[PDB]
């Protein structure tokens, strides 16, 4: 798969079996999804971006299926305008930015 | 050029002759740079990120030298922790995400 960047590179991922549309983001170090409930075993974290920080709940070894791949990775949940898959998952999937 | 995403994909660009370190960001729709004076010709824009909103100055037809290409693109200027090259510039360079 190859993504031109004319439109946002957004795909469907399944997090713990629930589908979420996510943005593939080389500018995000980690990943953060909204609207999913992952349970009580998390560590509190903060994440920053343009405009300030948000509180997040960090979850480890989450089961993800994306791009016909299956990984386990850390995901944060939080009030994010769009769901972001940062370089933590992208590296696990084997994606690169090419010119 | 191919960037694995183990490290942040940060490069040196020249904006109207001035060297800046920038992040190549597929999740940013637009581009925002701090610490450079572009000129008087701007419109003030509002820009939304993870934490909240920021006021910026938009510059059109700014000349950029990056990754061996020269482009002219729109660049905003603002209170940004990291200089960002988002999709407008990525598309113009012929960059893609690949799996
Ligand atoms: C999630 C994460 C974990 C650990 C480290 C980082 C850096 C993270 O990412 C946060 C972020 O905001 N990253 C953005 C780049 C960044 C990094 C560091 C500091 C500042 C900015 C992102 O790639 C690009 N994002 C993706 C999220 C969308 S959004 O969901 O928030 C949104 C979209 C439209 N309207 C409102 C909000 C906004 C957009 C961005 O800031 N874009 C501009 C740079 C053009 C402002």
- Which residue, A7, A41, A11, is CA-closest to A24? A11
How many angstroms separate the CA atoms of A49 and B1, rounded?
Answer: 27
Method of determination is: X-ray
The SS3 call for residue A4 is coil
From the CB of A30, is ligand 1 less than 6 Å away? yes
Residue A23 in marked binding region: no
Residues of B with CB under 8 A from a CB of A: 1-6, 8-9, 23-29, 32, 47-54, 67, 80-82, 84, 86-87, 90-91, 93-99
Resolution limit in angstroms?
A: 2.2
Residue B38 in marked binding region: no
**Which domain, by its residues, includes A53?**
1-99
Look up A25 and say whether it is catalytic. yes
Search chain A and give the residue with CA nearest B7. A87
Domain harbouring A56, CATH code: 2.40.70.10
The SS3 call for residue B95 is coil
Beta strands in chain B (DSSP E): 2-4, 10-15, 18-24, 32-33, 43-48, 53-66, 69-78, 84-85, 96-98
- Count of structural domains, chain A: 1
How many angstroms separate the CA atoms of B11 and A10, rounded?
Answer: 24
């Amino acid at each position: 798969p190859q993504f031109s960047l004319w439109k946002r590179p957004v795909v469907t991922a399944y997090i713990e079996g629930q589908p979420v549309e996510v943005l593939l983001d080389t500018g995000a170090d980690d990943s953060i999804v909204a609207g999913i409930e992952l349970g009580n075993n998390y560590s509190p974290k903060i994440v920053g971006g343009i405009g300030g920080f948000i509180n997040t709940k960090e979850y480890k070894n989450v089961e993800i299926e994306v791009l016909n791949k299956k990984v386990r990775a850390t995901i944060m949940t939080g009030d994010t305008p769009i769901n972001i898959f940062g370089r933590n998952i992208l590296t696990a999937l084997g994606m690169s930015l090419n010119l």
